[PDB]
Design a protein around this ligand. Structure first.
Ligand code: KP1
Ligand code: MG
Length: 423
């Protein structure tokens, strides 16, 4: 009787069974690296004299196509990456501006149910939306992965969030996950896989599911995971066909009599629009109880969201209420080029433009970085981001409220923190 994570790690280590706390050596299906972890990893490999990665088709590299105009080190790192990709015969390499980190990997078909996914970023948990075991690892582990196609993992315990009921109007999976995190706390799920399931999750789209697993790490989770269903299978198969990345996969599900460290019953019909308020993702408040505070900027589409359903719900709110308030900069960033195209074809982009919204291209590098330069001092911002920028948020006592795309759009409309149901 095993959880989905246990089964995935059992299969991957060739074991009959696995229990939390077991330390097992698991085959890696896909390893993703972007920005600096790329050059660290390649360098470590050079130092050990490793001529070849284990499988050039199970490595996904995101890297800036533009040579950085000043620093010679980054031009050097850039030449290094191109050499590696070429010599190793790495098939799957993408511009850092193909999309935000965690959008590009699944949309090209690189994440299937039952797979072990490792990534250089803290928010690789995102890919657990696909019934995959997905974790962020450092460059030392990443070099080991590139060399051998294996890594030691400690099997985590699972907390199961059973989410049932129907989401009320104007409420999204962003509000569900934020509400879960306000209760559990930034450290409440340390070492644990956070599994979301239940009738409410079944009805959610893949896009909505990804927003939840995206933020598992924000409560100290080891990862986030949702079992695959028909929507999952069809998304993955369609993505594989579009990009030529077909490979066999096994849909793995947890057992009905699996053990969990904890089980939360989440009443979805009770979730309301919420904000994560400065300065902790933990500090979650019902929108009404903060409503009224004037705001300077709104970011709709961020790390990792701004998929088509996010852009729809945002543009519907804005266009219905006649555009955006005065003295609010509203930046709209589709999660990927592929998502940008879908929005373009549906006339959504043209409409954001019409209301004086800035529409900008996504960049994986933006998710990793400093917010120095984007927010002015003392400015209040509403963001659909699913990750914190603590430490380097940044410029410097700027205030940043995390919200769903619906609430973010509402805020853009009124020019203040507002509950979208109150427009
Ligand atoms: C990446 C970003 C520009 O969306 C972050 C934020 C916090 C300003 O939304
Ligand atoms: Mg992210």
């Amino acid at each position: 009787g095993m959880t989905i994570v246990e089964k995935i790690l059992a299969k991957a280590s060739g074991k009959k069974e696995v229990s939390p706390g077991d330390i097992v050596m698991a085959n890696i299906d896909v390893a993703m690296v972007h920005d600096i972890t790329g050059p660290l990893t390649v360098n470590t490999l050079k130092e050990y004299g490793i001529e070849k990665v284990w499988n050039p088709e199970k490595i996904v590299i995101l890297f800036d196509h533009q040579v950085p105009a000043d620093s010679i080190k980054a031009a050097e790192n850039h030449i290094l990456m191109r050499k590696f990709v070429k010599e190793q015969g790495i098939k799957y390499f993408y511009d850092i501006r193909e999309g935000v980190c965690h959008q590009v990997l699944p949309e090209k078909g690189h994440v299937a149910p039952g797979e072990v996914v490792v990534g250089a970023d803290s928010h690789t948990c995102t890919h657990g939306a696909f019934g995959a075991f997905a974790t962020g690892i450092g460059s030392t582990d990443m070099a080991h992965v590139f060399a051998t196609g294996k890594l030691w993992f400690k099997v985590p315990e699972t907390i199961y969030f059973n989410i049932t009921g129907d989401l009320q109007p104007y409420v999204t999976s962003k509000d569900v996950i934020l509400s879960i995190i306000g209760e559990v706390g930034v450290d409440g799920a340390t070492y644990k896989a956070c599994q979301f399931g239940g009738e409410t999750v079944k009805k959610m789209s893949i896009a909505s599911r990804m927003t939840m697993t995206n933020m598992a790490i924000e409560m100290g989770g080891k990862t986030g995971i949702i079992e695959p269903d028909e929507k999952t299978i069809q998304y993955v198969k369609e993505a594989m066909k579009k990009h030529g990345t077909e490979r066999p996969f096994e849909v793995i599900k947890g057992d009905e009599d699996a053990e969990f460290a904890e089980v939360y019953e989440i009443e979805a019909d009770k979730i309301e629009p919420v904000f994560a308020c400065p300065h902790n993702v933990d500090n979650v408040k019902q929108a009404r109880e903060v409503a009224g505070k004037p705001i300077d900027q709104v970011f709709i589409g961020s790390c990792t969201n701004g998929r088509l359903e996010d852009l729809r719900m945002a543009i519907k709110i804005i266009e219905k209420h006649g555009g955006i308030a005065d003295d609010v900069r509203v930046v709209v960033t589709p999660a990927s080029r592929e998502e940008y195209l879908k929005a373009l074809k549906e006339g959504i982009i043209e409409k954001f433009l019409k209301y004086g919204c800035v529409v900008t291209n996504p960049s994986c590098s933006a998710c990793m970085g400093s917010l120095y330069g984007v927010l002015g001092p003392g400015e209040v911002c509403v963001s659909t981001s699913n990750r914190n920028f603590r430490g380097r948020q940044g410029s410097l006592e700027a205030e940043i409220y995390l919200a769903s795309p619906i609430t973010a759009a509402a805020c853009a409309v009124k020019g203040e923190l507002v509950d979208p149901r109150d427009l």
